[PDB]
Design a protein around this ligand. Structure first.
Ligand SMILES: Cc1cc2nc3c(=O)[nH]c(=O)nc-3n(C[C@H](O)[C@H](O)[C@H](O)COP(=O)(O)OP(=O)(O)OC[C@H]3O[C@@H](n4cnc5c(N)ncnc54)[C@H](O)[C@@H]3O)c2cc1C
Ligand SMILES: Cc1cc2nc3c(=O)[nH]c(=O)nc-3n(C[C@H](O)[C@H](O)[C@H](O)COP(=O)(O)OP(=O)(O)OC[C@H]3O[C@@H](n4cnc5c(N)ncnc54)[C@H](O)[C@@H]3O)c2cc1C
Ligand SMILES: Cn1nccc1C(=O)NCc1cccs1
Ligand SMILES: Cn1nccc1C(=O)NCc1cccs1
Ligand SMILES: Cn1nccc1C(=O)NCc1cccs1
Ligand SMILES: Cn1nccc1C(=O)NCc1cccs1
Lengths: 587, 587
């Protein structure tokens, strides 16, 4: 119980001090450690309900039951007198740096999860290295430190979404009294990309400064785990060497897939290339139906592009399908064309004009599910048909780390793999939501358990999401069809309503396109199982409700809470029309 | 408790049917009442906890313990045979329509609370009248049905706020690649007012249609309660008559105050006049420091006005003063001038030019709090120095309804006045938050208790707010200073952080102006006592957290909930810097 926790804490902490808030001897040790610039974890036994028991259990390691007690990498170092002896004799530095390994922690992968984990571990005195390398895309695209979200993901895509949203802000402004003429205004792609890339570059730099300031070793090198404690590194001159670490965190993420058809790799691109592309894509085909495919098609259309989406079966597989259809219907009414039930079988007509900064030209041939043919010309073809890890590049099979059928790492609920000192976080952790805030929380909480004696786990249930399509879609919890599957139709009640943002009235926008619903369980006091909203600022709307759902909110909790007026979100506080009543949700 | 409840429900309901969902005899009576277009409340006993005990208590009125049983204004009417007997003999309509009074409910005042109460009561078969009259402002301004929020409050001010926000959207668009030149674009006040007023006109019409479709009598007439059941009405020709009603709801609201100084009434205006003003205000002085004053000064500055605010002492008295100061400093850096610690002692230099649609010119004289004098010319002067009811207009003193020292109605926790059949809701209910969603909930919940046997009360605690200044300010719960006063500084912990919206990066806006904090009580599991946020879309951010605070959220509930990325709201899910630690909150 307590004895198994304390044994795990002492064995894996790099430098840790067992202490009491009221002890002047403990303050003296803390003061010396800060002078020497020795970072460490601290456990204050008068803050724990069973601190009395823990302090007796410490004697099993040190043969004493007093505070303070200092440990380094599993070894009792001393009490107050002994630590001060080592300091005044100039022996303490060499003691706190003694290790069987080069590093207490090696993180393979410098993205959302890996950077968060490495910074948190270094705070408690773990000597840490972060490895990051970006394998170039087929056309040669590469980028800096920070991972998929920072460089080719959430950050550039929401900036480009905002450039798209501003098109409708320019339109609205005339109705609110401003003198501009929207039909006379055009968009400059390269000016936008330059501004987006300048911000990304400031993030690349900020991460390198943060690692430097936390005393983390950053290696721009590709890592491969060749045994439980050995990592082979290849640098930018193909120099190969080996470094060793006590704990290993795998955090290498995923990359886009291509279909196995002629011309796909040679002549199409992916999201990896889009966010730094030097020319406007022009007339564009997006192949796929994920949130990546629809978000990219959406902003390209708002920026004035001629955009088509090729859909194999359905939009947004895995999300609530009533909401997915409403998302696509809005896109189609606002200029995005859809080739439904269709797959591709890519021919090059013109090479990309790198001189004049212009796209090439491609012939796309495909077929509909009934066998009819598809054939049309496009300037750019973007593939958004899923993402995958490539761990047979990071991980020698002899190490013994178990992978599932999709190539992701099978982990315990505390991120441990089948090898005791090796852990995995982020998109490569099998079965977990693949989101930046999840990877960050997992990485921070893991570092605290390894190096500061924490026990708290990451909670992966009911994590909210937002799809940043031209009209945004926020969700938290089950889809309506998943709720009915799990509990049966007779135990599910759905409250819903259309709404119109007040901002849309003077601007003469649509009356009954925005929509929201709560999916509830009758036999469990009308517990809210899932929340869904389509409208502007849907991520801001959804976030706060995610705390209430974590807390077990019921329909009655929504009813008794008062709305803020005038807002979109307040419509959730007065819902009353059920789907089983058959009454229209229009307002 | 069961027997005194049923007594109160039967005496109060206009038409009510006690029923069971499984009974075909009940179904037959429902369809007869529907065919007859007789509206009524229904109590399904096979869905209540103590439904078996109520069924037996019904015999004290009807001498039967069986179901269905229908009652009209306190009298038992009959079972299934007896009701069809009345229907077959064409006796039913005369029975359901017999009453001592003209109406079951008279609502005095057709604003946010009054219209909501009237429509909900009519749902249960209560014969209802709604009286509304708008007394003109000193310069003669008047408007249509719907109250302060609809015509001269939340709706027009947030539309005008949006027109102001679009000026900075026009500025941002250049940085995101759009080809306009903000510096050559101007704003037309009269075009914006026409769009705003056309939307308000559609709401006036919608409310009249809604009342007609619910069989509610709408009288555009001034009402005066002269006895507990008698309302004297004066129509548009000052024809005076009297109508009678069983229950009365006072819902007459407030109007702006003027200071007691020369020239104020003659030459100044209030928010009542601003939202339909036919000329641009020009160089404007706003006198006051309430959320009304700051919201109005805010959008006038963003439209291009030369705007000054004259402040007697502090901004936003009653709100968290750290947050109020941040609100005002942002406004001062973005064009609003402030005349601090200053009060007015108004002279007319030019009369308003109603023909050429031009403002007049005024000389304002005042003094600062030490002794220096204030003297400057303005084209428009706006007073926002509080609001008050004038219930002497509405309520004869002899009726016996107790008012407080401010002229508001003293009520019980179920809105009852000191006269048993008279109730008050909305801004005139003493001590309650003066907000439109509060008035709507109160009115709806009260109507259900009067006419459908409901017991649920309106919960007035922890009601969230938003101030729609140029940078918006949302809050739910206690200010920091009120928490410290209530519990003591050692029992309060405050977590806080600056943030920067992602949308502001490419647009080159400010790094550390947006700000958020959680005020928590240490000795109660670090319960969240109050939430505060300064930033864009603050009302959408705050709303969802109000449900969590209503359910008693702690800091650990915020910690275990995962963020949505990229949003402003997600910063609440990872707060960690305490005020007590002294660490900087900047990003
Ligand atoms: C277009 C797009 C949009 C997205 N939008 C959002 C959004 O709005 N919100 C959201 O929450 N999520 C979004 N995501 C998902 C988000 O990007 C991921 O969930 C997140 O980046 C996962 O972080 P990670 O640490 O697991 O991996 P990554 O961020 O992918 O980091 C892994 C890093 O390790 C490097 N690496 C790989 N192999 C090696 C090796 N052998 N040695 C060294 N380094 C190596 C990789 O090059 C990379 O730099 C989006 C993703 C995409 C593609
Ligand atoms: C500028 C401004 C901005 C505001 N912004 C917001 C906001 O963003 N959010 C928010 O929640 N609240 C806001 N409010 C507050 C909101 O308007 C009020 O809380 C709400 O309107 C109160 O509703 P009510 O039913 O109590 O009264 P009202 O809506 O004022 O309705 C009362 C009606 O009764 C009429 N009446 C008066 N006497 C008589 C009589 N003798 N006979 C017949 N009829 C009579 C009045 O003319 C009026 O039409 C704002 C207020 C102002 C002034
Ligand atoms: C069975 N399994 N599948 C994946 C991960 C595991 C597991 O139990 N790992 C925990 C360990 C403790 C010691 C060494 S590994
Ligand atoms: C008041 N309330 N709290 C919870 C559910 C309800 C409710 O019945 N809403 C009524 C209407 C909302 C919008 C138009 S009518
Ligand atoms: C009149 N009445 N009938 C039953 C209950 C009441 C009542 O308490 N009225 C409200 C009050 C306001 C101030 C003091 S009491
Ligand atoms: C991870 N977490 N969950 C709850 C509170 C925290 C925390 O300590 N936040 C760390 C940082 C936030 C922003 C920059 S560093």
């Amino acid at each position: 119980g307590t004895s198994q926790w304390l044994r795990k804490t002492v064995d894996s902490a790099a430098v840790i001090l067992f202490s009491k808030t009221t002890c002047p001897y403990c303050k003296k040790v803390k003061d010396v450690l800060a002078e020497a610039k020795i970072k460490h974890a601290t456990i204050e036994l008068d803050q724990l309900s069973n601190g009395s028991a823990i302090q007796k259990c410490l004697a099993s390691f040190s043969k004493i039951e007093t505070v303070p007690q200092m440990f380094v990498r599993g070894k009792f170092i001393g009490d107050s007198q002994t630590v001060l002896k080592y300091y005044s004799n100039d022996e303490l530095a060499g003691i706190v740096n003694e290790s069987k390994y080069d590093y207490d922690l090696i993180v393979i992968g410098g993205g959302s999860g890996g950077l968060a984990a490495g910074k948190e571990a270094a705070k408690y005195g773990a000597k840490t290295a972060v490895l990051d390398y970006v394998e170039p895309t087929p056309i040669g695209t590469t980028w800096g430190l920070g991972g998929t979200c920072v460089n080719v993901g959430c950050i550039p895509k929401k900036l480009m979404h905002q450039a798209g949203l501003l098109s409708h802000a320019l339109e609205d402004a005339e109705h609110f009294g401003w003198s501009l003429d929207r039909s006379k205004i055009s968009h400059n792609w390269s000016t936008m990309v330059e501004g987006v890339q300048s911000h990304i570059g400031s993030l690349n730099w900020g991460y390198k400064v943060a690692l430097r300031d936390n005393q983390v070793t950053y290696l721009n090198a590709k890592g491969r785990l060749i045994s439980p404690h050995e990592v082979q590194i290849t640098d930018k001159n193909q120099k190969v060497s080996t470094i060793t670490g006590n704990k290993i965190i795998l955090a290498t993420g995923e990359r886009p897939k291509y279909p196995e058809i002629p011309g796909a790799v040679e002549y199409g691109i992916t999201s990896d290339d889009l966010f730094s592309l030097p020319y406007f894509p022009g007339k564009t085909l997006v192949i796929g139906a994920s949130y990546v495919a629809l978000e990219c098609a959406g902003f390209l259309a708002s920026l004035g592009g001629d955009v088509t989406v090729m859909v194999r079966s359905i939009l947004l597989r895995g999300f609530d399908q009533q909401m997915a259809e409403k998302v696509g219907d809005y896109m189609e009414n606002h200029g995005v064309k859809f080739a439904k039930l269709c797959v591709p079988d890519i021919k090059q007509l013109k090479v990309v004009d790198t001189e004049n900064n212009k796209p090439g030209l491609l012939l796309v041939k495909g077929h509909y599910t009934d066998g009819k043919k598809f054939e049309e010309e496009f300037e750019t073809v973007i593939f958004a048909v899923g993402r995958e890890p490539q761990l047979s590049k990071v991980l020698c099979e002899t190490v013994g780390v178990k992978l599932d059928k999709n190539g992701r790492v099978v982990c315990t609920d505390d991120e441990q793999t089948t090898v005791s000192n090796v852990y995995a976080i982020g998109d490569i952790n099998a079965g977990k939501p693949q989101l930046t805030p999840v990877a960050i929380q997992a990485g921070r909480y893991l570092a605290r358990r390894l190096f500061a004696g924490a026990t708290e786990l990451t909670d992966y249930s009911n994590v909210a999401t937002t799809v940043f399509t031209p009209l945004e879609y926020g969700a938290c919890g089950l889809s309506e069809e998943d709720a009915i599957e799990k509990y049966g139709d007779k135990d599910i009640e759905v409250y819903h309503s259309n709404f119109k943002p007040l901002e849309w009235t003077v601007a003469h926008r649509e009356d009954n396109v925005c929509y929201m619903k709560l999916v509830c369980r009758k036999s469990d006091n009308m517990r809210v199982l899932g929340l869904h909203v389509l409208g502007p600022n849907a991520g801001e709307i959804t976030q706060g409700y995610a705390v209430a759902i974590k807390m077990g909110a019921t329909k009655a909790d929504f009813d008794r809470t008062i709305g803020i007026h005038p807002t979109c979100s307040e419509t959730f506080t007065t819902l009353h029309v059920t789907k089983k009543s058959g009454v229209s949700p229009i307002v």
